[PDB]
């Protein structure tokens, strides 16, 4: 019986095992059939085929009929003793046997016998692999090639994650998609920063590898940028999107090693976004590189062992307090992009404020439920996507923005302390010296921000050669106990005093301008 | 049933008891069969022997066949009163007996027996226990012998584990072979330094015993150290080499006592790396001299109490800021060696520093995925540790190369704060008498690093014991009530006063090197 039936329905099913040693059943939904929304022409995951064991008693009847019909006509006909004994007997046996489809213990072993015939190896861990197939609410989603295709009919492409939301092809003529853009363009005013945020936002699609980049940019305390945030999010939805936590990117004494649940989060994941916080909080590769780098990672699933799963998710990081950055490091400064908004919406906007607007409260919240809305925003991400990989490669270092990488690197140049003591305390005045192995300019220098900034543990060692790494070792050599001495400097407390010593889109923005842009 | 099952084709599976009590089914999996990528000519780990249910399944079913001709074809001649009588209900039974070959608990009940049947005393245990047996993507390599050899046919070896790459011997004409020898060389300048890099990274394929030695080299933000720890690290594959946090050094508090997680790592591995950290990190025997040795130790085990630790794997640990080691023990240093990264790589690579080139993002970003880079990878592997056999015998202490071991000792001469504050603050100024005892050098010592360095709790016995282990002692008597006291100096305060082969470097350097 279970050789017959994986003869008669083997293209429908696949039964493979899991991590915890069980076969698990999945099904190839077909339309016409009973179905959640938006989980066609792709498979869906099975406790118990039920559907199998409802077709097993009925469509199997037919063939049992047709048997039945078959002996009964080979009786029919006449022939020696054999007729008398064999067929009879036959007939008998067949109609004593014809009950057992029925009985529930034989379904159940049937199905048992037939997890071996339908088993196929290197299933599991093969399904959703290409991350250039995506699910889609109407079939799936492939951008292997321009433009991208939509699959409405078979196919043998192992996917089973899916979003519920419609794809339709990119037209501005819709009034949602006008209204959307109308949107963008307003909350960010700067064409080259739009494009250059659309072009990343779009790479959330993508769940291949990614060039590691982190999204740190500041906003006004009404910008916005917490309602995209959600749109992104609902867009692409739960099983390709999740809210994180500002805790991790702060790592206090607790590591990876630490049981956590959080950080099996981004586990095939495209998207991660960071809301805003309360205040600003203190973080240096507190493990930020390696959240950045694309490199393998391990995965400690709380109190159990250790896996190992790649990252792949684009990250956000967006607020309205500053971050505390105290580093010097190129590279550890070369995977960030810092970009301020200057739009602070308000219930009263005089025309004297050109950069802010009026607040349409049914707006940030409104809308991101409408069904509608939502399969737009994706069409707009779907082409943004395509213009990217059709102009930059899909290389989003490539892009040339001068917006960006200006303010980036001015913020670079503040969020550090050591410039600050140089050119405070000892720049323009060089008209004495008093050192004592840079020891004492180190406790200066600690309890410096220890009370104009902020506190923490302290280190020396450290501190020996960052010195080194800045113009106050202009004048600095060594006594003969060595000790490496500055040789000239003033200690400056109190007052003291200075003792001698572009283009604006013409109708349409979305077009991206010409390959200058 | 079950006992005509092992007689016929028992020759490739075997079974065993795991450490839970439960019995394993073990495949050896052949070519021409479904299968996993790069599995091939080893066992497989089977929870339910598929392959068992339908041989019994129909190749029973046809020696069914055979004796159902056998006793027709014995009907059919001619007998005596026997026939009518004996032959009929023997074929009547066994024609009722066919049917039962093709029921679940049948078959459940068959092979619950040839459980037994099939049961192979020591075969977990020693599952993986040969180190000259590499498991590879196209069979298993055996590199007991020179040069190193690949078998892809049958053999008795017990091999599980794997790697999921090929193996192709080294052909230093490859594009990729070309590009790979040219980036090591151009990451580290010189040839001897670099040779026994080389030579010290290509035993993480061994898993035998090695020579106890750690290796630290730091230096400049782009020496470029992760982007080959990360590529030896995953060609070498997840079951052979781990990622290991550096929480495992520098123990304090919980230590070993609380449970501990991350030990039952290095079971196995045979390479195991230490990445960069936040910034200087602090360590001392704390924990280490555990890991340096390949002895056996004993430590918490996830959720349990132990079992034992046989660790094997090579160990290397960089970063960009340098390590704080407080030690004068000879042994403690004699288990190390240092090196320092003279490349920075630069973007802008002005011609006057030949010490930095221009990055490659991609060279770092991709060139990880390509299976040839992996293939070529081995390829070098391979060849060094055959080189590594032929010319030193296994022994990575007896190769010679002048700048390594001496970075080490004049990175043993500093790190040491007591010959700082010696030769900082009392040599060069004795004439003066000025020492109540040990004590209030010991505290003036103590405060000073605390500031000049950073602070901790100290043992006064540990400083009065490391006292007579200075220089300082050339003048330290002791008075009538003893103490020792210092017999002249003066404590300083403030400032005051006193008052290139061209090509070929890949093959061999000579042996005087
Ligand atoms: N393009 C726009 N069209 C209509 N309303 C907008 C637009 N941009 C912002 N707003 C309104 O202004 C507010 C954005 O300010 P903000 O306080 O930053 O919101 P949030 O932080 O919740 O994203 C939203 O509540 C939204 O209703
Ligand atoms: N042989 C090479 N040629 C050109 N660029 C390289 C080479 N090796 C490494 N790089 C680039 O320089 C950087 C080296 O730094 P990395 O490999 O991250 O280690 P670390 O940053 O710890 O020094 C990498 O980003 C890599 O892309
Ligand atoms: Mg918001
Ligand atoms: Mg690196």
Redesign the interface.
């Known amino acids: 019986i279970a050789k017959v039936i994986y003869a008669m329905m083997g293209n429908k099913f696949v039964v493979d095992?899991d991590s915890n040693?069980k076969y698990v059943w999945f099904e190839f939904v077909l339309p016409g059939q009973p179905m959640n929304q938006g989980e066609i022409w792709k498979w869906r995951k099975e406790v118990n085929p039920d559907e199998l064991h409802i077709y097993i008693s009925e469509n199997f009847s037919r063939v049992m009929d047709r048997i039945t019909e078959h002996i009964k006509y080979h009786l029919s006909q006449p022939h020696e003793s054999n007729i008398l004994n064999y067929y009879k007997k036959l007939l008998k046996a067949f109609e004593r046997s014809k009950s057992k489809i029925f009985n529930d213990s034989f379904k159940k072993?049937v199905i048992?016998?037939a997890e071996?015939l339908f088993?196929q190896?290197?299933f599991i861990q093969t399904l959703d692999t290409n991350p250039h197939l995506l699910g889609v609410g109407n079939g799936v989603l492939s951008i292997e090639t321009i433009p991208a295709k939509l699959i409405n009919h078979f196919h043998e492409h192992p996917i089973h994650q899916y979003t519920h939301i419609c794809y339709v092809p990119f037209n501005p003529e819709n009034p949602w998609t006008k209204l959307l853009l109308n949107a963008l363009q307003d909350i960010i005013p700067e064409l080259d920063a739009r494009l250059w945020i659309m072009f990343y936002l779009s790479t959330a699609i993508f769940r291949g590898?990614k060039?590691?980049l982190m999204l740190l940019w500041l906003g006004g305390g009404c910008n916005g940028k917490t309602f995209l945030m959600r749109l992104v999010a609902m867009v692409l939805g739960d099983h390709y999107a999740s809210k994180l936590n500002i805790s991790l990117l702060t790592s206090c004494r607790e590591?990876?090693?630490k049981p956590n649940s959080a950080f099996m989060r981004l586990k095939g994941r495209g998207y991660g976004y960071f809301e805003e916080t309360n205040k600003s909080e203190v973080l240096?590769?507190?493990r930020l590189?390696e959240m950045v780098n694309?490199?393998?990672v391990?995965a400690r699933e709380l109190?159990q062992?250790?896996e190992?799963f790649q990252m792949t998710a684009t990250m956000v990081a967006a607020s309205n307090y500053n971050f505390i950055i105290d580093t010097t490091?190129?590279?550890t400064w070369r995977r960030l992009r810092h970009y301020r908004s200057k739009v602070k919406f308000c219930h009263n906007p005089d025309p004297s404020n050109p950069y802010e607007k009026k607040e349409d409260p049914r707006f940030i919240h409104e809308y991101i439920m409408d069904p509608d809305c939502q399969n737009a925003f994706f069409s707009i991400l779907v082409y943004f996507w395509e213009k990217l990989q059709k102009e930059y490669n899909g290389q989003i270092?490539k892009v040339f923005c001068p917006t960006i990488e200006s303010e980036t690197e001015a913020y670079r140049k503040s969020q550090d302390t050591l410039h600050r003591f140089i050119t405070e305390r000892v720049v323009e005045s060089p008209s004495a010296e008093?050192?004592?192995?840079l020891?004492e300019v180190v406790?200066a220098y600690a309890e410096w921000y220890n009370t104009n900034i902020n506190v923490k543990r302290?280190?020396?060692?450290?501190l020996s050669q960052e010195l080194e790494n800045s113009v106050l070792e202009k004048y600095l050599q060594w006594s003969?106990?060595?000790?490496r001495?500055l040789k000239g400097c003033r200690i400056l407390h109190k007052f003291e005093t200075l003792q001698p010593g572009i283009c604006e889109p013409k109708n349409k923005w979305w077009e991206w301008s010409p390959n200058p842009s």
Do not use: C, W
């Not at 003969?480 to 000790?483: D, I, L, S």
């Open positions: 095992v040693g072993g048992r016998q071996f088993r190896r290197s590898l060039e590691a590591t990876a090693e240096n590769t507190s590189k694309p490199g393998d391990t109190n062992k250790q190992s490091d190129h590279g270092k008093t050192v004592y192995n020891s406790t302290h280190i020396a060692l450290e003969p106990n060595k000790t001495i």
